[PDB]
Design a protein around this ligand. Structure first.
Ligand SMILES: [Mg+2]
Lengths: 661, 453, 49, 145
DNA sequence: TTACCTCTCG
RNA sequence: CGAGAGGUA
């Protein structure tokens, strides 16, 4: 066979600054760009209207009510024939409020910042690429230290070629005076380095193919006199040995992967769509406003302070800018992954704030909590009861539960039979509990199955399907023999019901999820539905037997049972008419072939007569034979109880056969 | 031809684990290898190796054809695992018309060219020798990809020599302005060598290699390196299987061999010559496996008894031991492995350089004068007078004339070593070329001739 | 519950996808080689090709 | 009981499950190299380690279940055991363009490449715990997150 | 561990 | 809506 082929793929990748922009940018009829949100304002102060350039702004994130623009007029969406996509007065985007769920916005940052994950891991990805001490790259990042030779890409007149150096005491003013206005800037950019602009630039001009060459050589040289020294030393030799492999690998991937190494330090910053951070008025909820929003404002603020500081005060020293650079970085860090560095970063009243990593992680993290399982419609719950008379394929469903689950189906019926004019008309009939609603409900559920599950669903048998039968009362009735699979008892257990809507779904339930089809357990092949408690007691009693010797007769039978029956029906009859008891011994003629399970015992007495007939008495049977060696008669000693079990098993087989026909 | 390697593997998988009618054939394996080899996005080399392994496993049913050998060489080369590439080449050569396949009209990076360029950088010129020779039998011209370096001296013919990346001395100082005008001047394109941020390799040489060009090594450095290893293996056999040995004079000799072997990397010489490791010999190992040469089911603790258990239970058996050599039935290799290498010599180089120059000359190459100058200087380092006649002959043959001082010093060397006859021959040809012999040397040459007479 | 969650994760991807792999190898079961009560011998073998 | 099953399945220490076993595995590896050559020694050593390990792990879990009267078929344990025992670790000595020094590759793969390639691939079997196994897989989406 | 229910509190 | 507490099976 030729396989039917389907190819699907999912790709994950870090994104460039230009992309984050395109995710959130539009050009209006005026020709004006929209998208960056600058102000920290959320809505309005007691006005309940989104502010402009605000975290909830309509123009950047889409309209709040459909068709009603910023101005307050309403143009009918569904028609683009003569509708300004963007109104002259305001950016309207008239079509839908759904966009507020999906639309994105971006924030420009004056200072380059660094992502936490690459830096945080002990085998830091940035460090692995850098080949410089982890402390040195980090120190520059969180504390004021300045690199001296930032770019190896371009030649520079000053030549200390130093690393991060704390002291800027080196003449810097005379150097600026000697140099032209910004002549110093060209030189400084080439040489002096600060913050993370330096990291971004060092990462940006790096030679990967060269990096591999150096590494391999160093890796080859290391291992000289390897495995031949004091315990302390070898350990160190190895740790370097690996850092080297790890680094070669990262670079190789970069060569063939289309992801640019500089993207790790971030120029633009992304913003979640406004709905996903409802921040609804905390009208007594008190937590309705999102911490997402709270964290967002801080980054927005420090950034605005810096943009102004630079514009306002070129004269003010780098000390003013240096002070607030660190502040901006820290807000972003908490927003991305707080607790990575272990900083509490919490308001005193508040718990440590929720970083976006927390949102994703764990049981309540998006993937486990929402992606793997979800709440559903067309479902119900109630307590369970014994239901002995039901058949294996059936279950009893309370009527109140049913009317809820099968409502749509009944409305159709009322309309189809023309007992109601409109959908609204019918819903009324359902409420007055008129008797007709019940005849229609019964008709609709006749060949439609339903699914039942118990709470701790340990194994497949936890969910099984049944044909529902309407019952009055408020509990679900279940067949006695299905309880082992569900592990259910009748002392407070509850169950849930689901209805299968599609035709495809309905076929699967009848054909692959019904009890008759699943009578053997998955683990070794054993029967899962077998008679278990009271039922077993009854079967044992029927087959238990009768007193045999001293128990039935006081004195030896030597010094000195009777009923003989021809067909089994007569015997069962005598039991009813009280002629005999369940345990009384009896003799039954058998016309068939010696199927009685009994021990291999030779006859107790053979009695042989002169004309030729021989009678053989065994413990449970008498066989009469003649000279021609033919068995004239066989009689079995038994009790009524034994014949009753045989008859039921036999009749059931024959009945099923006669029904098929 | 899609670009996504997987779509083809899916079709292969339907075939490999299916019924007999649909089983894979040699053409099939070859199509899947192409996808992986000619793919633009990920490492895809481990994958090729695994696929090859499957083919070898089905040896009885399937045997290789020419495209197989062709495709394989491209992959290993482009990925810079040159050692395996050479093993495969041995096969394509046996076939006729092979070179034509490897160069697929130059359509995909000129795989034939890439091989040669790599072999050289790696200093594997004995192999270059074999290859360049091979091409000839097939009448396929050396492709244009052979190219000059920033120092124009580099060319396949001259690069393997020891002085590296160094312009050759031509007497007259190279005309720097003249080179510029030639490549691009006034209008035109020159690969201006200024470093840029974008990740496209600056050497035009790197193009066509997935990650980068092979690292540069001279014939010399390579030769020392190759040498150490053979020795190391003998030492290795000594380390694990060698404390005990057949010879009864071993106790005195052991002390000597061990210290010495260590020295080699950084009498009983005959005994060392005697010692050998059988590698590539499946059979030797086979014999070894056979052995001819609480309270649960626990395998027996000694290795050799485990081997008996492995057999009884059917876990492994002798039939299972095969490799490509056994499977594809190539007999050429057995000879190569056992021999130790030949040590490096300046003279060794001279013979090889010359042989190379003619074949490239034969096949349409245009070596630069600087290249010849490279061979010339090398000849001078350890006296090799005879070469001078052929090489100067060739350079003028190539329509190139060298500066006079270099010419005279070699004539002086010949006079010093007594090769007066060679000097005269040079002057006679020099006259034919029309270049002028220095007068002072010329009178001296006549005086030397008078002395000989 | 922890043991089950983790066991399902290691082997979730395995589905029966083909009729014959084409192997010609099989494990060998002996009554001996372990002291095996006949019960154990029977149970291992039932259901196998 | 259950703790023991978690211990056996999550193989934190190879010896922890059976002392007799660690003995054999460390022993085999040292001894095998001298006796056999590079193309064939790693492969045979792997096959032997894989075989003993597999028997022991199934047998140890099973004894715990049989003590208490719970009967589960073997096929089921074998699907799980295979994943624990299916991968190999390339060693420190091995660097080539094809393979990096510490990596996890699958057994069938490694074996195939070894026949094909004269380049030395050095490998040894690593028993992986149930938890570790998941983290090394083909699907980032779920299998690993 | 799963599911289920009620409440109070800023 | 975010926390806390008492239950159920
Ligand atoms: Mg209960």
């Amino acid at each position: 066979m030729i396989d039917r082929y389907k190819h699907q793929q999912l790709r994950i990748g870090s994104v460039s600054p230009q992309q984050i922009s395109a995710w959130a940018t539009k050009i209006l009829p005026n020709g004006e760009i929209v998208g960056e949100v600058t102000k920290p304002y959320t809505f309005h102060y007691k006005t309940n209207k989104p502010e402009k350039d605000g975290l909830f702004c309509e123009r950047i994130f889409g309209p709040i009510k459909s068709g009603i623009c910023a101005c307050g007029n309403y143009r009918v969406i569904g028609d683009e024939k003569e509708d300004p996509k963007f109104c002259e007065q305001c950016g309207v985007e008239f079509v839908d409020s759904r966009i507020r769920r999906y639309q994105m916005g971006y924030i420009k940052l004056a200072c380059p910042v660094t992502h936490v994950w690459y830096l945080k891991r002990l085998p830091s990805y940035i460090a692995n690429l850098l080949d410089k001490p982890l402390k040195e790259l980090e120190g520059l990042v969180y504390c004021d230290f300045s690199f001296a030779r930032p770019i190896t890409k371009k030649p520079t007149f000053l030549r200390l070629r130093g690393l991060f150096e704390y002291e800027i005491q080196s003449w810097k003013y005379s150097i600026p005076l000697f140099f032209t206005t910004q002549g110093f800037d060209t030189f400084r950019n080439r040489e002096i380095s600060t913050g993370a602009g330096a990291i971004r630039e060092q990462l940006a001009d790096l030679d990967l193919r060269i990096i591999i060459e150096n590494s391999l050589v160093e890796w080859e040289e290391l291992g000289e006199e390897g495995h031949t020294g004091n315990e302390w030393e070898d350990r160190k030799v190895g740790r370097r040995k690996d850092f080297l492999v790890r680094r070669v690998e990262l670079a190789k991937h970069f060569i063939r992967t289309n992801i640019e190494p500089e993207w790790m330090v971030l120029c633009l910053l992304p913003v979640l769509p406004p709905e996903l951070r409802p921040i609804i008025q905390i009208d007594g909820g008190k937590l309705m406003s999102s911490d997402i929003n709270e964290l967002y404002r801080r980054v927005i603020y420090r950034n605005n302070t810096l943009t102004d500081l630079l514009t306002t005060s070129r004269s003010t020293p780098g000390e003013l800018v240096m002070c607030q650079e660190k502040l901006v970085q820290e807000a972003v860090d908490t927003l991305l992954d707080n607790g990575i560095r272990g900083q509490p970063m919490r308001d005193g009243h508040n718990k440590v704030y929720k970083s976006f990593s927390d949102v994703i992680e764990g049981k309540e993290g998006r993937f486990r909590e929402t992606l793997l399982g979800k709440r559903v419609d067309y479902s119900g719950r109630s307590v369970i009861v014994v239901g002995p008379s039901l058949s294996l394929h059936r279950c009893g469903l309370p009527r109140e539960i049913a009317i809820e689950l099968f409502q749509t189906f009944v409305i159709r019926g009322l309309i189809r039979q023309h007992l109601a004019s409109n959908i609204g008309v019918a819903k009324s009939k359902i409420r007055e509990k008129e008797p007709i609603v019940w005849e229609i409900l019964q008709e609709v559920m006749q060949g439609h199955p339903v699914l039942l599950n118990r709470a701790p669903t340990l194994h497949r048998l936890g969910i099984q399907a049944f044909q529902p039968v309407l019952v009055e009362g408020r509990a679900i009735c279940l067949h006695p023999l299905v309880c082992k699979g569900f592990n259910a008892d009748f002392d407070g257990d509850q169950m849930a019901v689901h209805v299968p809507l599609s035709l495809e779904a309905q076929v699967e339930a009848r054909l692959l999820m019904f009890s008759h089809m699943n009578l053997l357990s998955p683990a070794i092949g054993d029967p899962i539905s077998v008679p278990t408690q009271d039922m077993l007691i009854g079967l044992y009693v029927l087959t238990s037997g009768n007193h045999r010797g001293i128990c039935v007769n006081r004195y030896n039978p030597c010094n000195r049972k009777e009923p003989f029956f021809s067909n089994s029906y007569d015997a069962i009859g005598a039991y009813r008419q009280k002629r005999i008891n369940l345990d009384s011994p009896l003799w039954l003629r058998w016309r068939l072939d010696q199927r009685v399970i009994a021990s291999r015992e030779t006859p107790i007495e053979v009695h042989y007569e002169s004309l030729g007939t021989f009678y053989e008495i065994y413990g449970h049977y008498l066989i009469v034979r003649s000279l021609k060696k033919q068995i004239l008669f066989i009689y079995i000693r038994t009790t009524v109880g034994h014949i009753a079990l045989y008859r039921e098993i036999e009749e059931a087989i024959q009945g099923f056969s006669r029904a098929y026909s | 031809t899609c670009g996504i390697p997987e779509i083809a593997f899916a079709t292969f998988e339907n075939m490999e684990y299916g019924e007999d009618h649909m089983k894979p054939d040699t053409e099939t394996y070859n199509w899947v290898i192409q996808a992986y080899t000619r793919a633009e996005s990920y490492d895809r080399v481990q994958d090729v190796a695994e696929l090859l392994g499957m083919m070898v496993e089905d040896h009885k049913r399937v045997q290789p054809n020419v495209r197989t050998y062709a495709l394989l060489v491209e992959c290993f080369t482009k990925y810079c695992v040159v050692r395996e590439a050479i093993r495969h080449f041995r096969g394509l050569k046996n076939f006729e018309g092979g070179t034509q396949v490897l160069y697929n009209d130059g359509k995909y990076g000129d795989p034939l060219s890439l091989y040669l360029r790599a072999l050289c950088r790696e200093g594997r010129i004995v192999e270059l020798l074999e290859a360049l020779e091979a091409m000839a039998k097939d009448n396929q011209p050396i492709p244009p990809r052979a190219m000059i370096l920033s120092r124009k001296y580099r060319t396949l013919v001259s690069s393997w020599i020891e002085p590296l990346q160094e312009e050759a001395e031509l007497g007259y100082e190279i005309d720097y302005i003249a080179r510029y005008v030639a490549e691009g001047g006034l209008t035109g394109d020159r690969k201006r060598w200024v470093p840029r941020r974008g990740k496209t390799p600056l050497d035009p040489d790197a193009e066509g290699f997935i990650y980068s060009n092979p690292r540069e090594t001279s014939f010399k450095q390579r030769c020392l390196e190759e040498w150490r290893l053979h020795h190391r293996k003998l030492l290795k056999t000594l380390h694990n299987e060698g404390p005990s040995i057949l010879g009864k004079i071993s106790e005195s000799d052991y002390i000597r061999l061990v210290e010495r072997l260590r020295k080699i990397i950084k009498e009983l010489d005959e005994l060392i010559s005697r010692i050998k490791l059988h590698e590539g010999n499946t059979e030797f190992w086979k014999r070894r496996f056979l052995g001819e040469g609480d309270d649960d089911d626990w395998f027996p603790l000694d290795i050799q008894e485990a081997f008996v258990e492995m057999r009884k239970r059917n876990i492994f058996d002798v039939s299972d031991m095969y490799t490509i050599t056994d499977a594809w039935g190539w007999t050429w290799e057995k000879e190569i492995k056992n021999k130790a290498p030949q040590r490096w010599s300046q003279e060794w180089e001279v013979e090889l350089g010359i042989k190379v120059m003619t074949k490239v000359i034969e096949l349409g190459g245009t070596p630069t004068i600087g290249d010849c100058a490279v061979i010339l200087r090398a000849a001078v380092r350890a006296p090799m007078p005879s070469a001078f006649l052929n090489i100067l002959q060739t350079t003028h043959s190539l329509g190139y004339v060298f500066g006079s001082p270099l010419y005279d010093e070699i004539i002086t060397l010949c006079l010093d070593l007594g090769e007066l006859d060679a000097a005269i021959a040079i002057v006679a040809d020099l006259e034919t070329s029309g270049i002028k012999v220095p007068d002072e040397t010329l009178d001296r040459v006549i005086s030397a001739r008078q002395s000989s007479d | 519950g922890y043991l089950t969650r983790r066991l399902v994760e290691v082997v979730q991807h395995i589905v029966v996808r083909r009729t014959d792999c084409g192997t010609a190898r099989g494990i060998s079961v002996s009554p001996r080689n372990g002291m095996m009560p006949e019960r154990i011998f029977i149970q291992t073998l039932i259901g196998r090709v | 009981g259950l703790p023991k099953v978690e211990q056996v399945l999550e193989v934190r220490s190879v010896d922890s499950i059976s002392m007799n076993l660690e003995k054999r595995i460390e022993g085999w590896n040292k001894c095998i190299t001298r006796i056999l050559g590079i193309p064939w020694g790693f492969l045979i050593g792997a096959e032997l380690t894989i075989a003993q390990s597999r028997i022991s792990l199934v047998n140890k879990i099973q004894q715990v279940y049989r003590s208490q009267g719970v009967q589960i078929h073997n096929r089921h344990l074998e699907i799980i055991v295979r994943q624990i025992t299916s991968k190999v670790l390339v060693s420190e000595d091995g660097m080539s363009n094809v393979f990096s020094p510490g990596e996890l590759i699958g057994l069938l793969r490694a074996e195939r490449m070894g026949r094909a390639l004269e380049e030395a691939i050095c490998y040894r079997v690593v028993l992986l715990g149930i938890t570790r196994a998941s983290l090394n897989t083909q699907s980032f989406i779920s299998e690993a997150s």
